[PDB]
Amino acid sequence: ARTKQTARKSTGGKAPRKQL
Amino acid sequence: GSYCDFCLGGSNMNKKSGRPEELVSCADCGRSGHPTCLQFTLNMTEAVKTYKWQCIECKSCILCGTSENDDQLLFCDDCDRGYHMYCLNPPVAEPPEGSWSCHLCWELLKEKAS
Ligand SMILES: [Zn+2]
Ligand SMILES: [Zn+2]
Ligand SMILES: [Zn+2]
Ligand SMILES: [Zn+2]
């Protein structure tokens, strides 16, 4: 039950901040 | 060829596996991601590919289309839907222990046969 909150939402990743 | 929002490969190459896979581009913001990396399934993959998919945060509770207490907004597992735990037909109180299934999932569950 992936809920839309901190404990979960692992599908909310959008490229790590590395490209400045 | 873009990149996924989790391993940042492409619609023909995964960075976590090194395998070819078509990314999914969000219809709300436009970011790409591997359904596998998205924690999706093939049904979810296809679903997003056939309709306006949203990447978690963009995912609003279709039920009331608000996405207010998103911290409850459950995540579908067959399409890519999103419903506030307190919006569902049988409203959730706490994130289901097993694999939660949105309503599209359920209607699809029956539509499978007959
Ligand atoms: Zn990926
Ligand atoms: Zn998005
Ligand atoms: Zn709602
Ligand atoms: Zn679903």
The span from the CA of B42 to the CA of B63, in Å, is 23
Joined tokens for residue B92: 């959730």
Experimental method: NMR
**Residue B47 DSSP SS3:** helix
| Residue type for position B76 | C
Angle, vertex CA B60, rays to CA A5 and CA A2, nearest 5: 35
Instruction: Report the residue numbers after which chain A has a gap, meaning the C atom sits over 2.5 angstroms from the next written residue's N, or none.
Output: none
Given a contact cutoff of 8 angstroms between Cβ atoms, the answer to whether B1 and B11 are in contact is: yes
Chain B: nearest CA to A18, how far in angstroms?
12
Given a contact cutoff of 8 angstroms between Cβ atoms, the answer to whether A1 and B70 are in contact is: no
Q: What does the domain layout of chain B look like in residue ranges?
A: 1-114
The residues near B3 (Cβ < 8 Å, ≥ 6 apart) are A15, B9, B10, B15, B23, B32
Radius of gyration of chain B (CA): 15
Could B70 and A7 be called an inter-chain contact, meaning their C-beta atoms sit closer than 8 Å?
no
Query: What distance lies between CA B56 and its chain's CA centroid?
Result: 7
The span from the CA of B114 to the CA of B104, in Å, is 17
Q: Which residues of B touch A2 (CB under 8 A)?
A: 39, 74-75, 77, 95, 100
CB pairs under 8 A between A and B: 68
Q: What's the length of chain A?
A: 20
CATH superfamily, region B1-114: Zinc/RING finger domain, C3HC4 (zinc finger) (3.30.40.10)
Given a contact cutoff of 8 angstroms between Cβ atoms, the answer to whether B5 and B14 are in contact is: no
- If we measure between CA atoms, which residue out of B109, B111, B75, B68 comes closest to residue B92? B75
